[PDB]
Write a protein that binds this ligand. Structure first.
Ligand SMILES: [Cl-]
Length: 257
């Protein structure tokens, strides 16, 4: 039958990542065109995508990998099954890093917060919040019961996870205030360079120009699962087919072997 493409709402960080990685979001200069199928219906959240795909035998959608449940089926992409292991070793291609960025301006307090994020406790916040931990080496954190304010600015996609990390840190450092500003990766990089943010949040690789004078560090890997209804006999798609389906070029399930 006819493929029912489920898209996330305009401005969604997951939509931005998905369309960029699959090449559906093309730049013909400094103007980006989102080629998402014009027939695609919209869901406003991960829960909404899950409900729509579980509720319709012909539907396909995309969600954060950590949100995958038995109520839907994740497709293999290029014959690779989405998992902690295939995201970590780079076999699974629908993934993006959650980077934090800082400069030589990073305060002692900012450095203590980075140490917490790098610690066994910090890594546990990441995995408990269902993201993948890229780091294999772990350090111990002991609170200095510091005081002061931190400004963390950038990607909306990293904001929720940053909030969880700030909560766990403030439990150990009650006199530390952490402000998290969600705007975008480019605004976060600029804020760090302009010294208006202590730490920036970037949900993609930095360009050579952006990286100048900065250090970046992946605090998490965010995989994206392409999900279908459990009734769907299809189990794998190529990256070409994936882009064809979500751009509305391939519209029937019989074309997917
Ligand atoms: Cl929309």
């Amino acid at each position: 039958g006819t493929i029912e493409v489920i898209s996330r709402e305009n401005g969604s960080g997951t939509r931005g990542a998905f369309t960029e990685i699959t090449g559906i979001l093309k730049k013909d200069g400094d103007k980006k065109i989102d080629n998402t199928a014009k027939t695609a219906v919209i869901q406003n959240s991960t829960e909404g995508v899950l409900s729509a795909v579980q509720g319709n035998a012909n539907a396909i959608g995309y969600i954060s990998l950590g949100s995958l449940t038995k109520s839907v089926k994740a497709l293999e992409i290029d014959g690779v099954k989405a998992s902690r292991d295939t995201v970590l070793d780079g076999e699974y291609p629908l993934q993006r890093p959650f980077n934090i960025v800082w400069s030589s301006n990073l305060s002692k307090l900012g450095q203590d917060f980075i140490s917490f994020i790098h610690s066994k406790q910090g890594q546990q916040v990441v995995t408990d919040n269902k993201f993948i931990e890229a780091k294999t080496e772990t350090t111990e954190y002991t609170s200095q019961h510091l005081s002061g304010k931190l400004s963390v600015v950038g990607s909306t996609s990293v904001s929720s996870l940053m909030e969880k990390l700030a909560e766990a840190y403030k439990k150990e450092n009650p006199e530390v205030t952490i402000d998290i500003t969600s705007n975008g990766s480019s605004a976060g990089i600029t804020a760090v360079k302009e010294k208006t943010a202590d730490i920036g949040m970037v949900s993609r690789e930095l360009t050579p120009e952006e990286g100048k004078s900065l250090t970046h560090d992946a605090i998490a890997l965010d995989g994206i699962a392409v999900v279908v209804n459990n009734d769907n006999k299809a189990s794998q798609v190529s990256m070409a087919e994936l882009a064809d389906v979500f751009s509305g070029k391939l519209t029937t399930w019989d074309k997917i072997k």
